[PDB]
Design a protein around this ligand. Sequence first.
Ligand SMILES: Nc1ncnc2c1ncn2[C@@H]1O[C@H](CSCC[C@H](N)c2nnn[nH]2)[C@@H](O)[C@H]1O
Ligand SMILES: Nc1ncnc2c1ncn2[C@@H]1O[C@H](CSCC[C@H](N)c2nnn[nH]2)[C@@H](O)[C@H]1O
Lengths: 332, 333
Amino acid sequence: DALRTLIRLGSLHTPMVVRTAATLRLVDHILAGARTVKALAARTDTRPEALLRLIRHLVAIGLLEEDAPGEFVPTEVGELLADDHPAAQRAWHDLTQAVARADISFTRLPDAIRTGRPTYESIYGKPFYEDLAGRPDLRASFDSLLACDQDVAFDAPAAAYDWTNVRHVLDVGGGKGGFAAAIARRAPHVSATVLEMAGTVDTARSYLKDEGLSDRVDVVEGDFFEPLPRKADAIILSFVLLNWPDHDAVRILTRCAEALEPGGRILIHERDDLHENSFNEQFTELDLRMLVFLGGALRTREKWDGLAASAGLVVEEVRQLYDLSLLVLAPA
Amino acid sequence: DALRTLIRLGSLHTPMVVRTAATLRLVDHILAGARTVKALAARTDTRPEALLRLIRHLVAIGLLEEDAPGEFVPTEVGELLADDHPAAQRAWHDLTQAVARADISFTRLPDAIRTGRPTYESIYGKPFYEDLAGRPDLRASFDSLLACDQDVAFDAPAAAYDWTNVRHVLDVGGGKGGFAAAIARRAPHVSATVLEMAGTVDTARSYLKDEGLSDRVDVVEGDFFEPLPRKADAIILSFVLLNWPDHDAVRILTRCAEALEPGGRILIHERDDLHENSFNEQFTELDLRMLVFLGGALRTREKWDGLAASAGLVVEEVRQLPSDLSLLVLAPA
Ligand SMILES: Nc1ncnc2c1ncn2[C@@H]1O[C@H](CSCC[C@H](N)c2nnn[nH]2)[C@@H](O)[C@H]1O
Ligand SMILES: Nc1ncnc2c1ncn2[C@@H]1O[C@H](CSCC[C@H](N)c2nnn[nH]2)[C@@H](O)[C@H]1O
């Protein structure tokens, strides 16, 4: 009934159990033979009696079940925490990796609601990307989480755009380069450049080199708030602007506008929504993460028009493809 | 499908959104006339744009709904966050009160799984009850949270025991006295004493006075690891032993055994799920809280027999209580 539902929604221990079990690679250990609690505790380096208590709640919430007496086995839902599942939900729930670590910022959500400012720095001592610049493991973990998709997640946006009159593509904060590579495979005449931060540029280079695309896709280390390294016919902003508050996003959009060739276009790859369609879990998860990690925000369809106009741009067309959008921006 | 379920179970922002809305008294402000985001931000002292983003997730999870354009209204489930609902779920999710504050100990759950030791102290600087002894606001909201049930939650365990041969009852760690009061109204010949800590003894005394029971129920400040202040025919341990690891629970149980009158009994009011029945959300919520708050634990039916034996006791009988709780009656072995 109504009481049961509210207790479940407000329960902080349940997602922490899911995250703890992910961090211990508990499902992997079961799958690699660790039948009993005794052997599971050995592999995860935990107290048997406490691990049982954890496992009890994992059975209660339907991630593990008991097969034979004392033998715990993942359910269909628990199997998604195997480290080799395509959705990478174990690493995304791993408290040592960048995202689940950043989610501890939600423990201070009232502060963000009162001020509109992110809470990450009050916990970890630096803002999100400064923290990542001083912690190579966090830098690398963040890039690998977002790029867990890379081989196929940019196939759809690359197909949604006519590359016939594109000669060079600049991917501004393009991660490990998977979007650039998707376009390259889709359009052999096109060349590309990825602009990224320290650390990320190295794994982007080796990923692109390992696709056999280093003849087609360059990587430049730099700062997207400074003049861009080069001009281009299509400039990519894929899950970049939501990281930034309005004024920084306009500056980023302004830098991209300065770097368009005649006829060029700015492409935004992001989750958006008509306002009255945005009261959904997918939108809020990303939007509220952006608030507490960085002070960024998801933007409704209506708000893209205004941000575009501040940058001297217009939204020319939107295409729906999670469920993502490709926004095509032209000079106003 | 399976992926959607796991993302929902792992989501940390959803309970923090619930807790934030509880702490801002948001549903209360809506119900007292705040019909816009603008008026709600005024009453909650928050940034309008950020409050809307919070509200968005509250609509997506079914606590709020949009009635008219811009007018957000609690659902049937959201109405349980009204401050005067009998289940007290707003204060139980209020991040300024003791329990939701303590729940932040779950952020370090792997440490407790690795060591078996609570994480509360590493976050707030002192163990649970030392923290509460130095924070009168936290002492008072913890007592008020557990006693939010007071008027009716002890009617069942008091009716599960025959008070015929009982003259005095000692309620060891008995909160604000709600249990002692239930017995008093159940059995007019009975006298009682509540043993509690500083702070709690004062609200226990005024609660009992305000029931008209100060003729029947005394309150004594002290420490139930020391010799108890008095002997009794029935000694109550209601939601006390789960706060403690085995060795500390044996000491408390031993202190009670030393204080029993001839023929006396120890009454344990708690859960007692058979191990095979304990893989359920009620058992695990309380058990995992005790782990990270205090290093205590819920005890299965099987484990009650072991702990009783360590204290020189036997579980004499068990009565399931209607509402799933139990009264366990312990006699000398
Ligand atoms: N000042 C700056 N100059 C250049 N790049 C930056 C930057 N600040 C952040 N970045 C990069 O912006 C990216 C945002 S994550 C999106 C990565 C990639 N575009 C993608 N698309 N879809 N999934 N992943 C991160 O990598 C950051 O390093
Ligand atoms: N050394 C000590 N000496 C005396 N009381 C203590 C104590 N340590 C903790 N307590 C008290 O033990 C209580 C546990 S909460 C249960 C309160 C009451 N028995 C009840 N039953 N059902 N709901 N509430 C708290 O109050 C504490 O102060």
